[PDB]
Structures are given as structure tokens and as C-alpha cells.
Amino acid sequence: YEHTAVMPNKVGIPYKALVERPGYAPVHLQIQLVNTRIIPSTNLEYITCKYKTKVPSPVVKCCGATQCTSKPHPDYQCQVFTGVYPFMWGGAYCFCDTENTQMSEAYVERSEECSIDHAKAYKVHTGTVQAMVNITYGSVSWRSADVYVNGETPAKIGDAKLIIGPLSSAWSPFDNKVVVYGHEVYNYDFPEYGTGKAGSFGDLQSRTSTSNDLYANTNLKLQRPQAGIVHTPFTQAPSGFERWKRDKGAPLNDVAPFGCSIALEPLRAENCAVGSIPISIDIPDAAFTRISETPTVSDLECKITECTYASDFGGIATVAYKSSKAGNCPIHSPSGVAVIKENDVTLAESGSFTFHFSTANIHPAFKLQVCTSAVTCKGDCKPPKDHIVDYPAQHTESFT
Amino acid sequence: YEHTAVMPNKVGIPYKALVERPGYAPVHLQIQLVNTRIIPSTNLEYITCKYKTKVPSPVVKCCGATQCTSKPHPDYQCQVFTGVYPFMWGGAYCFCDTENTQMSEAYVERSEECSIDHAKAYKVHTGTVQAMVNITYGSVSWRSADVYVNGETPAKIGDAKLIIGPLSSAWSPFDNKVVVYGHEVYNYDFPEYGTGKAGSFGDLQSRTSTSNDLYANTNLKLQRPQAGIVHTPFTQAPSGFERWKRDKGAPLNDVAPFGCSIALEPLRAENCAVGSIPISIDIPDAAFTRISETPTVSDLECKITECTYASDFGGIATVAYKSSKAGNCPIHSPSGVAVIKENDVTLAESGSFTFHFSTANIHPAFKLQVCTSAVTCKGDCKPPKDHIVDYPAQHTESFT
Amino acid sequence: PYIADCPNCGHSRCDSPIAIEEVRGDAHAGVIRIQTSAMF
Amino acid sequence: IATLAPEPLVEHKHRTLILHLHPDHPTLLTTRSLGSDANPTRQWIERPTTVNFTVTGEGLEYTWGNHPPKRVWAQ
Amino acid sequence: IATLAPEPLVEHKHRTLILHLHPDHPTLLTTRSLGSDANPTRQWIERPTTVN
Amino acid sequence: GDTVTVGFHDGPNRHTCTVAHKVEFRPVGREKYRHPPEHGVELPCNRYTHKRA
Amino acid sequence: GDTVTVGFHDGPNRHTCTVAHKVEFRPVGREKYRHPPEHGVELPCNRYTHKRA
């Protein structure tokens, strides 16, 4: 009875399949893939952020030169300068007039915002998708368990053992190269660590926040201070993190395909509705009811009464139930034409009980399996009027 | 002059290419891919280890039953038992004779060795390969820098900017599924977390060492203690971590293809010699010597004198150098037939200096570019006798 | 020092204070860690 | 304590959202046609504008500024 | 007071018992196909072995 | 044991005695142990008594 | 050893205790010794401490 089932990847709607175990009473499913969070394999390549030209205070030798050296600070720009007369609080102070030397030095450093407000590149591989699958199973009526997709993983949470996927729809909405910012995720071809052109994205490129080493192509060019005054002309491109916040591109949670949402959290891409998942469950046999205890319902009749050719469960149909015992009777349309809101219907001794459903074909000729009794609920449906609210329960469009 | 170069992936041997910049003096390379450590993208799926049936001490009710409950311990096996007469230090102590009840309970728990001596599964993706490339460049004579393979990453360590790969030889010697143990790495199709059959590998399956939850299919079956004595028959498969240490398979550092070594370290696969790498460098132009300062060497002559048809640099050839100035002269065979030990040769005013090399064709007709002067060092070679030591410098076998 | 039921206590099942549980011949160095029920 | 743009005027058409819209400040609107064909749109809106969106069968979503994202069945 | 070998791992197949098996000591396993064709089997098993 | 090796200690001397004899201990059962365990099923072995009567 | 067999001597009595347990000692290495030697390479074995802290 290990109920294999191909199953559409779509998040917010149950998939009430039916266990046709030969010998005992069938049992309905209710498989709602409440989430499709993905979490691909990734690598933190480098944080970037806007620089801060945290200038070390220049040297001023008063009569003669002060040769600079290339200190190992990131992008340590330093250039000796002569021909000053530095006004500092008493007019000038160095008594020479051309031998007055000024050595300006400036290096690039991570902002304090780099720790917290920072873009973040990644080389993104495929990884392994997940889900908090609820099944309000059978008469168990509950399990809300986190699972995987790889087609040999069980998750014995509740009582049922369930194996999912691998899904066929391998579209990772993440591209190979991704930039990430706070919550807005950008599938951007970041240039690389160690290379980013100044002004362009990644002018600062630190491996992480702690990493004292980095790559700072900022085109930081010191110029001589003017007219014998102490200061430090640092001529520099404002960061490619400054832009990339107001001349950027749009976020993947606003431009992705096939229906995904995003988080700066394990780097999941939630709820990506695409393709199918070959899902298979091993039910606990204890949860089964033996066949000789559920009422046999045959010699019945089914008919629509007001079929709504729609998404919400507007389709209805009375069923002239013709039972033997009285009790519950799980139901399902093995044809995917009709999706039913009721998993189970209570029965007195051969009464009648309408259920709700939804279809996509004008003439819904769908079988209905009322606990081992098939029936065609043939009829005709009506279009609605009022179509602006969230996503459907029908999801069965085909040739009609 | 950004010297693109396809380049064989092979670890322990330099690749002394030649910079043919039009206008200034050429400069030799010496590119030795000292390492090819890989570090694929991976995921810790579950640690396993051998269980320990750390039995909680059974209950003994003396007259009447003690119903057990299914406590949430991993694989909490518990079975009530009656019909005892438990000899405990005073003969029996419970005065009844059949109403003497004994409730045995046993759960599975990680060994203390699980923290330290533990196999370790992984879902292994491809990731990104690395290297501590030494170049004793030109006249720079040194840089030993850690780099990447992705074909836009520079690493400005030293003075040269160098872009490597992506390599064409995407054989990750790791399979998709891998088990890991201390240092011996096994490309094993581990069953999964949550499933492993008892006795088989992964009978215990803990996500990590800290993870109090796990999956313990050990087939732990308690049996009743014998003849009215206190003890706890726990009948259990010794672990699939016990086996897997003496009925295992061999390690990937002993069964891999295409020449790899392994570590329980970042999960690299070192020194995988396979295929080529399209490598390209931007030299510092300052390191160039202008063309009008190196001696022009033409009107020369080259000839082998004792060519050894071999791997070690046994091939030799005098060269009737015919210089203009006197000084150094970088050398290289642009044909891959001949691999030369000397990057550079010193020159007096038109002297002669032998170099060493190695070839693979009986008639080595290889050009030799002595600092912008080509020459065929045609000749014939001799086979050696003494072939049992590590790996070659020749690596140029072709049709001969 | 706990006392439990040794399984083959010279003759047969006695109750020795040094009743051996949790034998661990799981290391490599010729060593076993043992628990007696006795607390020396 | 942060921004919020005035609510939209939702208007139905056949597989199409007319939206007479009227913000306080320039608002970046954007959408995601949830087909594997994404076909997104972006436009800062400061001038009040009646816009349009060819919604598909399976759904579209709608982001009136930092007001939360909406969603729509247009069968 | 006597011996006992750890329980087997029963595994189903079509008219076939795969049995991943893992003893403590050399264990003589044996069977009897209850047809009038007996077709028995004997093998001491000390090394863990998946049999059929 | 390949042999058997017996001996007391009078007190001044070891004064032992030793002999060859092929010894084994199969337990009764389809398990070929080397030694009796603490647990397991009971079944009809052959064995000598403790007693004198 | 096929078993494990423990015991002190109080002084009036032997007063020992014994048990079944499958014991082996593979050293870590591709050599399957039966016992640790005096020499050879050192490499990362698993082992218990001398200490209490």
C-alpha cells in the first residue's frame, strides 16, 4: 500500500489522494505542501559595502622631504607633496616656504555599516529543497512535519513514513552568481572578489566582515592640499555600494519566474510552484480500517446541482447515497478534473449528502470514488463573475 | 601582454611559458600548480556512530502490572513482563510469584565515541577548486599565493595579477553521496538520514553530535529476564558503524581516479591531475625589460650532445650563443615537445652554455626561443634504465 | 558503590558489587573502559 | 517607524487589473506573473496613474509600495 | 545458560527473502523449503552477510 | 586450550603438573561461540555436576 | 578476548565478576596487528585518557 503519487509542486492547497489498498477500507490523503523552501548550496565569496576613506593624519615635515612607503593597508594611497605653507591656528608654522613638505596618506577601510548594511555575493549551486508538509491524515487528522525532496528520505513525524521527490523541475530561481542585501536578493553577475572596478559594484571586496584584508579598487587618488593649509584631498569614487542602492536592479522576489519568495535567512526561495513531485507514503496499517466495517455505498446516484466552472469550491453535487451500514466514507475523484473540499462524508442508512468541488471542463465527467464505489457525476457548469483574490484550488486546466 | 595560456592540470612541476610581448624583452614564466585542493559544495546530512544501549533501569512491581508508555527517547523500546521472581541480594524480594512484574525499557543513544569517532555522510555538489600557485617569476623570483579556478578571479599577491580556469576537467572524484571517517573518505551511497536499516550502515543517524534527536533503527528487541533474576535482555544488532570499520570498502584516497589525495579538513581532494586550465596573467609592466637592453643572440647554433629520451631532465644541448651585449637571456621551447629546467641563461659576449631538458620523441625537433631568437635543436635521444621513483617533468607524450 | 547481579560470578549468577556493565572494547590502544557497579 | 502608500483602487476586467492609483510620494510598484515566464514590471509612481496588468490564469502578485504584497486569481 | 544470535533483518522481495544479517559469532543457519523437494541450505555465518 | 596445566602451591614450592589434551567448548546450539554468555536461551547441554552425592 | 573477567581480592575471598563481551584491538593503520609495538609511526588513534579532570 506504499502509495506512490506524482504530485504537482504548488504550495497552498491540499492534494487529497486516496489509498486504494486491496483488502481493507481505503483512506484519503490530504497533502498540503505548505512550503517549498529551497536552500541551495552556496558560498560566501565576499561581503561588500561602501568604503570609508579613514585618512591617517598626514605628515608635515617643515624643511625637506619625507619619502612615503607603501604600507600594507588596503588600497594604501600615499603621495608625498611639497610646496606648502600650512596655516594651522597661528598662520603657517613651518618656517621654510618650498621645503615645507606634506605627506598625505589614505587607505580604504570597511565602514561601520559594512558589518550590518552590506551587500553579499555568493556562488550558488543547487542544494536540496524542503517543506513543512501538513497532512491532516485519514482519521489521524494531524502531522505538520519538515521534510526533504531527495527521493529516499523519510520523515517519521506523526505516524506515517513519507518519501518525496526528487522533483523534476530543477529551476533554481537563483542564478549561479547572486548578490544579497538585507532581504532583497539580486541574481547579479557580481564581478568577483579581488577585481571590482572602482565605482562599479564591489569596489570594496572583503571576504567577510572580520576579514582585515580586502580588495579596494576605489581609484583613491590624493591631491595636494591648497594654498598652504592642512587638509587631505582624497579624490575617490563614491562606492559601488552607494550606487547599487539607487541605480540597482530589482529583486528576485520581484522578478523571479515560476512563483518564489525569498529570505535573508537560510537563503531559501520559498513556495516555488513549478512541476511535479513523485511522492510516496507508507501509512501505518493500524490507521487503516478493514473493509468489512465501512458501509458499502453502491446502488447510489450522483448529480451536480449548481456546478460553478471555477477555482473556489463552487461546484456542488448531491449524491443519493445507498449505504449498507452507517458511518463515514472517504471520497475522492481519481480523475484530476474535479478537486473536492470534503475528504470524508458521514452517512446514515442510505441518505444523501452534497459535497463541494471545483472543475475546469464545461462538462465535468469525473468519477467519484465514495469508499469503493465509483460514479460519474456528469453535468454542466457556470462561469463566475468576481475574480480578484489569491490562488485557486482547481489547478487542473486541460483541454476542454 | 595579458598572457593567456592553456595549461595542463598537474601539480608538482613548473610550466615555464614565455611572455612574447611585442616591443620589450620577453620574460619567462614558472607556473607550478603546487596544489589542486578542491573543496566541493557539501552538506552535513547526519553523523552516524555506533549506538550505546544505555538501558534505563527497569521497573519491578511486585504484585500486579505496570503498563509501559512509549517515551520519546530515540528507539525507545519498552516491554512489560510478568512471571518473574527477581533474585536481588536476598534471594527474591517480591513476595508474589506470577504477579511479580518487570518492565524493561531501553533506548538508543549516541556513544561517547560518536562525538569523536564517527562516520559522517554528505550530499556533495561541485564547489570551486584552489591552489597555492608558486611563481618564481621572471626576475621577481617569488610569489606563493592561494588562488581560485573560476575564470575571472585575480589574486594580486606578489605583483602579478593572474586569472585561472575554469578547468575543463570537471570530474569531481567525490560522488554525489559520500561518507567520511576521520581521514578515510568513502564515496558511499549512504541510505539516508531517518531510514538506515538496522545492522546496515547508519543504524544510528544523528544530524550532528549535539542533536539529541536521531533515527535509531537498531531492531532493539527486549526479552524477558531469565529465571527470576534482575537484568535486561537487550537483543540488538551491533552497529552498522561497527561493521563499516571491518567489512567496509576502500578509501577514495586509495580508489579514486585521475590522481587525488584527501583530507578531513575542508573536504578537499588535493592534487587532482586531470585536463587543462586556461590560465591568463597580467604581468607588471615594470617587471619587463625593454628589448634594447637584453643581448640579441641570433647567428647562433644549437645541438644536443647527450639527449636522454626520458622524464628527468636528462636531455642536454650546447648552444653556440652569438650575443651582442652580455647578460641574461630567458629561454623556452614554445613547442611542448621539450621541457627545460633552465628558465634563464647567463651570457658573455657570444659564448656557449648547455641547458637541461626532457622530451618524448626520438627525434626532438623542438624550437628554442633564446630571448627572441628561434632555433631548432634537432637530434636524437637515448632510452634510460632506472624507472622507479616519483612523477615526471616531461608530461608531453604524443605521436612519435 | 552499587551492587548488581554479575552473570557468571565464579560459579554462576551472584550479586557482586563489581558487577560489570558497559564494556567498551571500542578503542584501539589495547584499552577497555569498564564500569563496575562498585565505586572505587 | 516607516512608510506606507495609500491603498490601491482595485478594478476588475477580463484577466486584467485596471488599477486607478494615487500615491502620496514616488512609490516603486512591481509584480511577478507567477508563470515560469516571470514577466515582471517596475515603475516608480509619483504621479497618479491608471495602470494595467495582463494577469494570467495561475496568478499575479502586486506590491503597492512597502504595503504587503497582494495576490490575485484571474481565471 | 546458553547461546543466542542477534535477530535477523527481514526484507521482503517477490518470493524471495533478502536477509541482511549480522551475527556475534559463527552461526549455522539453515532452512527447509517445505515442498517435497526439500532443497535445504547450511552455512556457518560469522561474517555479516546479506543472503537470499 | 591445546593443553591442560594443573597445580597447587604447597607453600615452599610451586609443585605443579601439566599435560597435553585437545580442549574446546562448543556450546550446544547452532552458534559456535568461544565462551558462555550471560543471557540467551536455555537448551539441553551436557555438563558435569557440582555435587558429590 | 571473547569475554571480560574482572576481580579484586578482599583478602578472605577471591570475589570476582565476569561477563561476555566481544573484544578486539585493531591498531589504526593498514597493518592488522594483534598488539601495539614499541616502535613505528604515530598516527591518530582513538583511546581513553589516564586522567580524571
Q: Are A368 and A356 in contact (CB under 8 A)?
A: no
The rounded distance, in Å, linking the Cα atoms of B225 and B227 is 7
Which residue out of G6, G13, G17 would a mutagenesis test of the C interface target, given it has the greatest number of C Cβ atoms within 10 Å?
A: G17
Q: Which of A375, A355, A354 is nearest to A365 (CA)?
A: A375
Three-class DSSP labels, A7-43: EECCCCCCCCCEECCCCECCEECCEECCCCCCCCCCC
Q: Which of B352, B356, B109 is nearest to B234 (CA)?
A: B109
The residues with which A216 forms a beta bridge, in sequence order, are A204
The residue of chain G with its CA nearest to that of F35 is: G2
Instruction: Work out the number of other CB atoms within 10 angstroms of the CB of residue F4.
Output: 12
> Residue type at D43?
Q
Which residue out of C3, C16, C26 would a mutagenesis test of the B interface target, given it has the greatest number of B Cβ atoms within 10 Å?
A: C26
Q: Which helix (H) or strand (E) holds B255?
A: helix B252-255
Exposure pattern of E26-40 as b/e (b: 16+ CB <10 Å)? bbebeeeeeeeeeee
Q: By a Cβ cutoff of 8 Å, what residues of chain C touch chain G?
A: 6-10, 14, 16, 18-20, 23, 25-34, 36
The rounded distance, in Å, linking the Cα atoms of F36 and G2 is 10
- Cα angle at B212 between B210 and B218, to 5 degrees? 115
Helix (H, G, I), strand (E, B) or coil at B113: helix
Q: Which of B262, B116, B248 is nearest to B185 (CA)?
A: B262
And the C-alpha cell for B18? 614565455
Method: cryo-EM
Q: Which helix (H) or strand (E) holds A123?
A: strand A119-123
The residue of chain B with its CA nearest to that of E23 is: B237
Query: Regarding beta strands B134-135 and B31-32, do their DSSP bridges make them parallel or antiparallel, or are they unpaired?
Result: antiparallel
CA distance readout (Å), B50 to A215, B161, E49: 47, 50, 19
- Spatial neighbors of E28 by CB under 8 A, at least 6 apart, are E42, E43, E44, E45, F30, F31, F32
Handedness of CA B257, B260, B263, B269 (dihedral sign): negative
Q: Are A75 and A213 in contact (CB under 8 A)?
A: no
Query: Regarding beta strands B355-358 and B339-340, do their DSSP bridges make them parallel or antiparallel, or are they unpaired?
Result: antiparallel
The rounded distance, in Å, linking the Cα atoms of B362 and B307 is 9
Backbone dihedral region for residue B138 (phi beyond 0: left; psi -120 to 50: alpha; all else: beta): left
The residue of chain F with its CA nearest to that of C20 is: F38
B233 chain-F contacts, CB cut-off 8 A? 39
CA distance readout (Å), E38 to B293, E30, E41, E42, F26: 97, 12, 9, 13, 28
- Spatial neighbors of A385 by CB under 8 A, at least 6 apart, are none
Helix (H, G, I), strand (E, B) or coil at C34: strand
The rounded distance, in Å, linking the Cα atoms of A339 and A353 is 17
A126 chain-B contacts, CB cut-off 8 A? 125
Q: Are B32 and B15 in contact (CB under 8 A)?
A: yes
> Residue type at D16?
T
The rounded distance, in Å, linking the Cα atoms of D27 and D47 is 9
- Across the interface, whether the CB atoms of G44 and B183 are under 8 A apart is answered yes
Q: Which of B265, B246, B263 is nearest to B201 (CA)?
A: B246
Helix (H, G, I), strand (E, B) or coil at A337: coil
B251 chain-G contacts, CB cut-off 8 A? none
- Across the interface, whether the CB atoms of E6 and B237 are under 8 A apart is answered yes
Length reported for chain C:
40
Length reported for chain B:
400
State phi, psi for B394 to the nearest 5 degrees: -85, -60
Contacts 24+ apart (CB under 8 A), B241-250: B241/B48, B241/B49, B241/B50, B241/B118, B241/B119, B241/B201, B241/B203, B241/B204, B242/B50, B243/B199, B243/B201, B243/E22, B243/E48, B244/B119, B244/B179, B244/B201, B245/B181, B246/G26, B247/E47, B247/E48, B248/B186, B249/B186, B249/B188
Q: Are B19 and B89 in contact (CB under 8 A)?
A: no
Q: By a Cβ cutoff of 8 Å, what residues of chain C touch chain F?
A: 7-8, 11, 13
Backbone dihedral region for residue E36 (phi beyond 0: left; psi -120 to 50: alpha; all else: beta): alpha
The rounded distance, in Å, linking the Cα atoms of A157 and A279 is 16
Entry resolution in angstroms?
7.5
Q: Which of D74, D71, D75 is nearest to A259 (CA)?
A: D71
Q: Which helix (H) or strand (E) holds A3?
A: strand A3-8
And the C-alpha cell for D16? 486584467
Helix (H, G, I), strand (E, B) or coil at A287: helix
The rounded distance, in Å, linking the Cα atoms of C6 and C15 is 5
- C-alpha R_g of chain E: 12
Query: Regarding beta strands D16-21 and D9-13, do their DSSP bridges make them parallel or antiparallel, or are they unpaired?
Result: antiparallel
Residue identified by cell 499575479 is D60
**DSSP code at position B228:** T
Instruction: Give A300→chain B minimum CA distance, Å.
Output: 44
Handedness of CA A242, A246, A252, A253 (dihedral sign): positive
Instruction: Please name the member of G22, G44, G46 whose beta carbon is closest to the beta carbon of B113.
Output: G46
- Across the interface, whether the CB atoms of D38 and A257 are under 8 A apart is answered yes
